[PDB]
Amino acid sequence: RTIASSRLRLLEYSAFMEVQRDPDTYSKHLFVHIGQTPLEAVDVRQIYDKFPEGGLKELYEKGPPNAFFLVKFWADLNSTIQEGAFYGVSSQYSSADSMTISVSTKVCSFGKQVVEKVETEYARLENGRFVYRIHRSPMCEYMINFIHKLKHLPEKYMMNSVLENFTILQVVTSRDSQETLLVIAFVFEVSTSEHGAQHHVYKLVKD
Amino acid sequence: TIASSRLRLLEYSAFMEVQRDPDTYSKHLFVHIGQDPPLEAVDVRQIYDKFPEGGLKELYEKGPPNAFFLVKFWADLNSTIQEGAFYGVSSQYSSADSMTISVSTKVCSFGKQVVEKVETEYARLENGRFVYRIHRSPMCEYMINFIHKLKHLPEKYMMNSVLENFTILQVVTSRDSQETLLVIAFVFEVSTSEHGAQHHVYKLVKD
Amino acid sequence: RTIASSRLRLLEYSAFMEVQRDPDTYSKHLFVHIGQDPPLEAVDVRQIYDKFPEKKGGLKELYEKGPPNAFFLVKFWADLNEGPGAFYGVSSQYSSADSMTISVSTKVCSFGKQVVEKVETEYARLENGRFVYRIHRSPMCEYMINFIHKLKHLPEKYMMNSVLENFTILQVVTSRDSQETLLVIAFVFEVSTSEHGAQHHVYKLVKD
Amino acid sequence: RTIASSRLRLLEYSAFMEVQRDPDTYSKHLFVHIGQTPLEAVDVRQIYDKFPEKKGGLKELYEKGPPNAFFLVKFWADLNSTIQEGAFYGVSSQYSSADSMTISVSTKVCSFGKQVVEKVETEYARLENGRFVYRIHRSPMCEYMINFIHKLKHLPEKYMMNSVLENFTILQVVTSRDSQETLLVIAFVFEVSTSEHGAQHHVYKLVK
Ligand SMILES: CNC(=O)c1cnc(OCCO)c(F)c1-c1c(Cl)c(F)cc2c1C[C@](c1ccccc1)([C@@H]1CCCN1)O2
Ligand SMILES: CNC(=O)c1cnc(OCCO)c(F)c1-c1c(Cl)c(F)cc2c1C[C@](c1ccccc1)([C@@H]1CCCN1)O2
Ligand SMILES: CNC(=O)c1cnc(OCCO)c(F)c1-c1c(Cl)c(F)cc2c1C[C@](c1ccccc1)([C@@H]1CCCN1)O2
Ligand SMILES: CNC(=O)c1cnc(OCCO)c(F)c1-c1c(Cl)c(F)cc2c1C[C@](c1ccccc1)([C@@H]1CCCN1)O2
Ligand SMILES: *C(=O)CCCCCCCCCCCCC
Ligand SMILES: *C(=O)CCCCCCCCCCCCC
């Protein structure tokens, strides 16, 4: 399903690990992935307790409400590649207007922000639209260590228990006006399916 | 003062701006390095304990040694303007060569990276040299809240005590090659002088 | 309202004075400001010709050369409500879809005569898929600073408006190498008497 | 002789008219020319009466300094009608500095010590052989100057041109655009050339 406010569209979002064993051998494992192409609503009060309290509530009140989405991820943490490994995030956005955007990714543990990454991006005019590409943004050591700790657990239900109190809040703003363009609240479980990583998108509402 | 063999820092300023009325604006500078006398050297091992294990030591070992500097700031946190206030950072760099730079600003508390902001800038030919201007980059909420918390302390010595374990590491790289162009370690105290904000620059060396 | 020809868009225009209160505190006063599209009212260019008598490089001559889409009239109600060391400046920004080197000529006319001309050349910068031209903090010439001071010393705002009837500014932006007219703005002035401060009104210049 | 302060050097200065009678015919007449190559001193108080006084004047600029930036140029302009005048009247000049900076060249034209017209041109440097060079190429003269040259040329005798020129002066002030620091100041005074060798000039260092 499509994640788009009236000002910005999320085209793609992937978090992955890449291994280049040698100059001729390359492997990539996707942890989570929202690829390029009806939404169910979720009351934002149902998730407030798990997010910062410039928190999710203040951001929602500031608006616009059409910019708010919840994504449930079932992350693939299976050791499918022999891990020099690179851990990264790639994402792509588009707008109708020519503007610089700022993508804030806040990582929270028990509702409290522990690390934050802020990336500004300039648009490329492409096919009449303005496209923003954040390509292979390295994951911070906190996240790489967190993934390694999860993978050392012997049971997927233990990974789910740890993940119950782990959340990510992505806030995209227009750099110069500081207007909220898109807000995505990410929640996680580990995937147990043969099809791998899965996701479900919901529109965040209030009343 | 601050220049490696590949990149020169022309200006750096952090400030708050208030709109008093539709035609009147006030600006308060917290810190400012404006636009050559010799620099005193500081052994980089004297500051590693506050910048421990992309860290300062790892970057310094990778080199070049001429790219590393330490700036001590005495920040002006006096309420000189009645604060909708904008908190921002403006900076300018220059080089003899045309390249795309990536500016990473890492905010650390007790030696741990809590926020990282990354901004990419494209060279502009100006007066026979290449200039990079990052104008009015908004401060993240973590920094605005940190400034507000410091200002609520009743004594300036308490602010200095909190600031003992707060550091900022700015790393400028050539975007495509990832070569280190300039690294600045920033450390802070609150200014108690009538002259306002002050700074002192040192060259980082390893005896 | 938006000032844009088919080749160049005016994003911002501000004239201001800046004062340093202490080493870390600066105050800025805007005299006039056009900040960052609703439709524009049209004004026949013959209704303003009598106030721009200057012939060579003047309004009528440029309008006749064209293109008509490049011509605008801005009415300003300037806010004239310091110490030594005050900075008087002008900041402006433009954008285009194409990469150009532009030349910005600002002609100041007083009592029907061109008294000052300031010329600035600007090189396109690729930003967000468009080309931006920024003329940041261009210092006002002493003639303009002294003119502002003389207006402020007048005891009545109607005397300021009478002196201002004879004062016009013509801004002509051209493509540097071809000398093609990209944008022409005729600026006319009054002093603001409102509590809201500086005001402006944009009109498109037409002929019949 | 060399016109250079510790921050800026004047390489060349020429005022001229060009006539392109047809696609194959070109003519150029130089009115004045300082081409690329000790100085006699003149006390700046000897010329104060002929230049702008009080605010932004020669005296105020001289007192602000640096004293090494101030020069007086006497010109004997060639006003002979040597070409059949569509003609273009222009000024071309070049400067150089050791530093990378944007300069602003103000040319004030004065009659009886009062500024009548001013042209301000900003220029960006080009890095050339380890020097930053500024070129103002074929800057069009304003109509005031073209009409003044035509009026002088209408006088039947050269002494009559010298009489009118007695109270005509040009003050060129070059500043660093962003800091407004004075880089170079040249006071120009004029007579008409009566020699077969044409246009002449003499450079003096202004002292106090
Ligand atoms: C306090 N409110 C909530 O816990 C909550 C309320 N309503 C939701 O959605 C409604 C639309 O269905 C949520 F998603 C969450 C939520 C939130 Cl806020 C969270 F931070 C983590 C988290 C969940 C659910 C869960 C998960 C399930 C599937 C995939 C990913 C995570 C579950 C929790 C048990 C183990 N796993 O982990
Ligand atoms: C353990 N080593 C250090 O602490 C250190 C060593 N040598 C330096 O420089 C050498 C040139 O002399 C430093 F700067 C620092 C340092 C560092 Cl690493 C830091 F993280 C914060 C910090 C300081 C100094 C200080 C400050 C004083 C004035 C202005 C700004 C900051 C002082 C600390 C007490 C309260 N304030 O805050
Ligand atoms: C001969 N034609 C004109 O005078 C004219 C005609 N039509 C206009 O607009 C049509 C859309 O409205 C104009 F603007 C002007 C004009 C022009 Cl050309 C000018 F050089 C100055 C000037 C004015 C009007 C004025 C002013 C008012 C408000 C703000 C600024 C200036 C008025 C004049 C009395 C005091 N103030 O000063
Ligand atoms: C009041 N002080 C002066 O008049 C003065 C004093 N001392 C000078 O020089 C010292 C080094 O000799 C001057 F140059 C000038 C001066 C100045 Cl300020 C001026 F505005 C015009 C002007 C002159 C001289 C003159 C001229 C002669 C030759 C060439 C160009 C001009 C002469 C005057 C009669 C006709 N022509 O026209
Ligand atoms: C540090 O700066 C981290 C930047 C944000 C990384 C987001 C990647 C999260 C998706 C991976 C899913 C792993 C299961 C928790
Ligand atoms: C209008 O903007 C004029 C700009 C300055 C023109 C300077 C040329 C003066 C030299 C010509 C000598 C003619 C004798 C008076």
Cβ contacts of C81 within 8 Å, gap of 6 or more: C197
Contacts of B161 (CB under 8 A, 6+ apart): none
Write the single-letter amino acid at D143. Answer: E
Report resolution in angstroms: 2.0
Q: How far is the CA of C135 from the CAs of B4, C12, C93, C102, in angstroms?
A: 29, 10, 6, 11
Distance in angstroms (rounded) separating the CA atoms of residues B184 and B203: 10
β-strands B24-33, C25-34 pairing: antiparallel
Q: Where are the alpha helices (DSSP H) in C154-195?
A: 157-164
Output DSSP code: residue C129. T
Name the closest-CA residue to atom 8, ligand 6.
Answer: D15
Nearest residue of D to residue B127, measured between CA atoms: D125
Cα distance between residue B23 and residue C200, in whole Å? 13
Q: Strand B112-122 relative to strand D168-176: parallel, antiparallel, unpaired? A: unpaired
DSSP per-residue string spanning B78-137? ---S----EEEEEEEEEESS--EEEEEEEEEETTEEEEEEEEEEE-EEETTEEEEEEEEE
Question: How many CB atoms are closer than 10 A to CB C136?
Answer: 12
Chain mean position to CA C73: 10
Q: Which residues line ligand 5 (CB under 6 A)?
A: A 15, 31-32, 75, 89, 105, 107, 115, 117, 139-140, 142-143, 147, 166, 168, 188
What H or E segment, with its residue span, contains residue D161?
Answer: helix D158-165
Please tell me the distance from the alpha carbon of residue B178 to that of residue A59, in angstroms, as a whole number: 35
Cis amide prior to A65 (ω within 30 degrees): no
- Residue D13: name the closest of D95, D80, D71 by CA: D95
Say how many domains are in chain C: 1
This entry's atomic model was obtained through X-ray
- Choice from C31, C51, C54, C204 to test ligand 3 binding pocket (greatest atom count within 8 A of CB): C51
Show residues of chain C in contact with B136, CB under 8 Å: none
Site to probe by mutation for ligand 2, drawn from B107, B164, B202, B207 as the one with most ligand atoms within 8 Å of Cβ, is B164
Query: DSSP state, B154?
Result: S
For B165, the domain range is: 2-205
CATH number of the CATH domain containing B49:
2.70.50.80
Contact partners, residue B69, CB within 8 Å, separation at least 6? B2, B182, B183, B184, B185, B201, B202, B203, B204
Residues in chain A after which the backbone breaks (C–N beyond 2.5 Å) = 37, 53, 83
Q: Are C122 and C77 in contact (CB under 8 A)?
A: no
User: In Å, what is the CA distance from D6 to each residue of D70, D93, D182?
Assistant: 11, 19, 11
Separation between Cα atoms, residue C66 and residue C50, nearest integer Å: 19
- Per the CB < 8 A criterion, the answer to whether B87 and B18 are in contact is no
**Of C117, C137, C139, which is closest to D119 when you measure between CB atoms?**
C117
Tell me phi and psi for residue A46, to 5 degrees: -70, -20
Euclidean distance between CA atoms C106 and B97, whole angstroms:
34
* Cα–Cα dist D119/D162, whole Å: 24
Question: Residue written as tokens 């009239």?
Answer: C73
Category of C108 on φ-ψ map: left (φ > 0), alpha (ψ -120 to 50) or beta: beta
CA distances from C14 to A8, A185, C78, C89, C184 (A): 30, 40, 11, 8, 17
Question: Which alpha helices (H) appear in chain B, and where do they start and end?
Answer: 56-62, 141-151, 156-163
Q: What is the number of helices (H) and of strands (E) in chain D?
A: 3, 13
Contact status, residue C133 vs residue C97, Cβ threshold 8 Å: no
DSSP code at position B3: B
Q: D165 CA distance to ligand 4 centroid (A)? A: 9
Planar angle of CA C133, C137, C142, nearest 5 degrees: 125
Cβ(A171)–Cβ(A59) under 8 Å? yes
Look up tokens 């192409």; give the residue: A37
Query: How far apart (Å, rounded) are the C-alpha atoms in residues B56 and B51?
Result: 6
Alpha carbon of C94: minimum distance to chain D alpha carbons (Å): 18
Asked if omega into A64 is within 30° of 0 (cis), the reply is: yes
B126, amino acid identity? E
- Tell me which residue of C29, C11, C39 sits closest to C202, measured CA to CA: C39
Around ligand 3, the residues with Cβ closer than 6 Å are C 43, 47-48, 50-51, 75, 77, 161, 165, 168, 188-190, 203
Which positions ≥6 away from B191 have C-beta within 8 Å? B74, B75, B76, B77, B197, B198
CA distance C73 to C154: 27
Q: Which residues surround ligand 1 with Cβ inside 6 Å? A: A 42, 46-47, 49-50, 72, 74, 160, 164, 167, 187-189, 202
Residues in chain B closer than 8 A to C26 (CB atoms): 26-27, 29
